[PDB]
Design a protein around this ligand. Structure first.
Ligand code: HEC
Ligand code: HEC
Ligand code: HEC
Ligand code: HEC
Ligand code: HEC
Ligand code: HEC
Ligand code: HEC
Ligand code: HEC
Ligand code: HEC
Ligand code: HEC
Ligand code: HEC
Ligand code: HEC
Length: 318
């Protein structure tokens, strides 16, 4: 008649190869047996180990009597002759998690079933860290007793994760932005932030101070209500940054803008955002403009401060 092997595809480990060439020399070419009921063949199904113990599938001949059991906690490898294949955890928003037998077997004995029978381990699908922090799966063991708690070592199980003590933000025109994880941890839980507020990988939309006031990034908390104002105090997130005495490179010489003199009559709010950006890389306003009303002329126009027109010496060195 001619017929041969058929494998069983398993989403999390080496497949199981059924073998006609065996169960044939035994039953003697009788077919109706496994194919009239045991295995449909027209619209077959996927059975769990249990569904076998309960008689269905291979559990309808591999009891212990006719042929060894699908329950002998030390006679599984008879079928699951597998070649290993660490477990792949792909989550839309976290470091691909991995679990593998080869480093867990030699920790109980060869105990399989301890896990594959413990409905609170191999039960749920798409488990969470909530569900897991309450003993269900993984944290069944890893629960502050048998093994390290699950409220930690995230990099141990997940791909990369493991948080950095201090993070640096490179900036052009400003300086540098320092933020401390350590200190921000003993105050919050991962998901309070990750992912909504920030991501794990290493790219995404590099927000802007302005964006913050909307509710994103540091501004999600730093706004003057929950945490300190994303508006001022600058000397916090940005190290040495300090409003100081600049020096312009102008066609007719040098221009001088002292911050101090102005910061005794004004607040960053007055100028900055609407009138003067911070980044060195701006757009040079012309004295033509400063007369129209723009730049220094927003207030420097005789009525308020004094006009750009006259007194060219005050802001210039010629
Ligand atoms: C008489 C010699 C047999 C014929 C005719 C067929 N089988 Fe089998 N068979 C068994 C299993 C575990 C499967 C898997 C089915 C599933 O996973 O859904 C199969 C598969 C087949 C197929 C496909 C053949 C192929 O080469 O792809 C057909 C059409 C089929 N079988 C015909 C189990 C058993 C079994 C239990 C001991 C016996 C005695 C036989 N099969 C015998 C025959
Ligand atoms: C699910 C489709 C099955 C898997 C997986 C396996 N079988 Fe069977 N099987 C049956 C008998 C009577 C024997 C021979 C006698 C014995 O050694 O106990 C077998 C043997 C196996 C083996 C061992 C092969 C070897 O000689 O080393 C494996 C790994 C195996 N089977 C896997 C009978 C039946 C049967 C009853 C009609 C069914 C439904 C299955 N086997 C199903 C599977
Ligand atoms: C004795 C050495 C063991 C055998 C044989 C197998 N395991 Fe495991 N295993 C564990 C987990 C969390 C999973 C993932 C969830 C799932 O797969 O449903 C697995 C998975 C398997 C699978 C395949 C699963 C599938 O859907 O195809 C097989 C065939 C398998 N395991 C064989 C966890 C554990 C565990 C708890 C600590 C132990 C020690 C073992 N597994 C041991 C065995
Ligand atoms: C006082 C008003 C502040 C000045 C001066 C600036 N900041 Fe910040 N800042 C913060 C972070 C995390 C970054 C990097 C953001 C990212 O990489 O996505 C920065 C960056 C800037 C920039 C560029 C973006 C923009 O145009 O707004 C400028 C010009 C800048 N900062 C000036 C964080 C913080 C923060 C911690 C909560 C505070 C209080 C400040 N920055 C304050 C100011
Ligand atoms: C009487 C009309 C004045 C003469 C002489 C000039 N200025 Fe000024 N000026 C000031 C700043 C901050 C700049 C730099 C602006 C930038 O970098 O975007 C300048 C630049 C110039 C220039 C270039 C513009 C042009 O081509 O016309 C010239 C020619 C120049 N300044 C001549 C600041 C001030 C200021 C301090 C408050 C006053 C009152 C004036 N400038 C007045 C004159
Ligand atoms: C050959 C008869 C097997 C023995 C012996 C054991 N398993 Fe098995 N297993 C086998 C097959 C053919 C299949 C699935 C086919 C299908 O219809 O889907 C499986 C499946 C599993 C599973 C998935 C089921 C579940 O976990 O809910 C696991 C995890 C698995 N097998 C584990 C396992 C263990 C630890 C065994 C001892 C209890 C065991 N299997 C023996 C075939 C065979
Ligand atoms: C292994 C030793 C882990 C530890 C410790 C932590 N997690 Fe975990 N986590 C692990 C696995 C295998 C899974 C998959 C669960 C499943 O559905 O099968 C998870 C899943 C996550 C997820 C995705 C689900 C969700 O909560 O949205 C997240 C958010 C995640 N893990 C986060 C996370 C954090 C924040 C951890 C430490 C602070 C961490 N995990 C530890 C395995 C392990
Ligand atoms: C809110 C105050 C946070 C909490 C609590 C946690 N994290 Fe965090 N994390 C936060 C920020 C502001 C940033 C910087 C953004 C950047 O892209 O650098 C991060 C960054 C990380 C990273 C590094 C990403 C990278 O640079 O490639 C990781 C992987 C990370 N955070 C992990 C992590 C873990 C596991 C936490 C719980 C212990 C945790 N963070 C909490 C802010 C916050
Ligand atoms: C809400 C979830 C926050 C996020 C995300 C960030 N910060 Fe934070 N930060 C938070 C709180 C609860 C406080 C309160 C204010 C206080 O007085 O501590 C803080 C504090 C800081 C500090 C202040 C240091 C000091 O005041 O002496 C720094 C250095 C700081 N935060 C920086 C910072 C940066 C740059 C962040 C985004 C990249 C960031 N924080 C996020 C709450 C939250
Ligand atoms: C006008 C009334 C201002 C006041 C008061 C403050 N700033 Fe200022 N700032 C102003 C100008 C004209 C410029 C540059 C214009 C250009 O586009 O080149 C600046 C620049 C800065 C910068 C970057 C340069 C530097 O000082 O290193 C920073 C860091 C800055 N200003 C910060 C800042 C802060 C902290 C203020 C309030 C406490 C503040 N400025 C007031 C104009 C005005
Ligand atoms: C409106 C809010 C201002 C902006 C924007 C800038 N300046 Fe100003 N400046 C302002 C006032 C009201 C004054 C005080 C004197 C007065 O009669 O109004 C100042 C002063 C100066 C001075 C020195 C004056 C003194 O020492 O007596 C300089 C050096 C000066 N301002 C420079 C300057 C430049 C270059 C500006 C734009 C790049 C600028 N100022 C903006 C009000 C305002
Ligand atoms: C049952 C027992 C479990 C379960 C349900 C999971 N793990 Fe795993 N694991 C367990 C123990 C007690 C240990 C040893 C702890 C100790 O030394 O005290 C481990 C260890 C880990 C490690 C290795 C750490 C080491 O080398 O010591 C990893 C890689 C790990 N566990 C991952 C992991 C994942 C991803 C799980 C969910 C799929 C998981 N374990 C479940 C005990 C058990």
């Amino acid at each position: 008649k001619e017929t041969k092997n058929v494998p069983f595809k398993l989403k999390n480990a080496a497949p199981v190869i059924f073998s006609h060439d065996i169960h044939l020399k035994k039953y003697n070419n009788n077919c109706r047996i496994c194919h009239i009921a045991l295995f449909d063949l027209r619209k077959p199904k996927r059975y769990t180990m249990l569904d076998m113990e309960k008689g269905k599938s291979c559990g309808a001949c591999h009891t212990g009597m006719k042929a060894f059991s699908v329950a002998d906690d030390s006679q599984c490898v008879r079928c699951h002759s597998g070649s290993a294949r660490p477990v792949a955890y792909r989550m839309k928003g976290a470091g691909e998690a991995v679990f593998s037998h080869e480093v867990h077997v030699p920790m109980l004995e060869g105990k399989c079933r301890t896990c594959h029978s413990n409905r609170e381990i191999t039960g749920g699908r798409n488990v969470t860290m909530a569900q897991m922090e309450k003993g269900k799966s993984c944290g069944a063991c890893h629960n502050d007793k048998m093994a390290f708690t699950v409220a930690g070592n995230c990099g141990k199980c997940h791909k990369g994760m493991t948080p950095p003590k201090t993070v640096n933000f490179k900036m052009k025109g400003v300086a540098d932005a320092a933020f401390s994880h350590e200190f921000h941890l003993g105050m919050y839980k991962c998901n309070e932030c990750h992912t909504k507020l920030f991501a794990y990988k290493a790219g995404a939309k590099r927000f802007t101070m302005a964006d913050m006031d909307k509710g994103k990034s540091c501004g999600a908390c730093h706004n003057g209500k929950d945490a300190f104002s994303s508006a001022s105090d600058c000397g916090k997130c940005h190290p040495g940054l300090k409003p100081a005495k600049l020096t312009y490179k102008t066609s007719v010489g040098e221009a001088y803008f002292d911050h101090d003199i102005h910061l005794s009559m004004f607040k960053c709010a007055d100028c900055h955002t609407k009138v003067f950006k911070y980044r060195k890389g701006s757009a040079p306003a012309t004295m033509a403009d400063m007369e129209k009303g723009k730049s220094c002329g927003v207030c420097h126009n005789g009525k308020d401060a004094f006009s750009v027109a006259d007194d060219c010496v005050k802001c210039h060195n010629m």
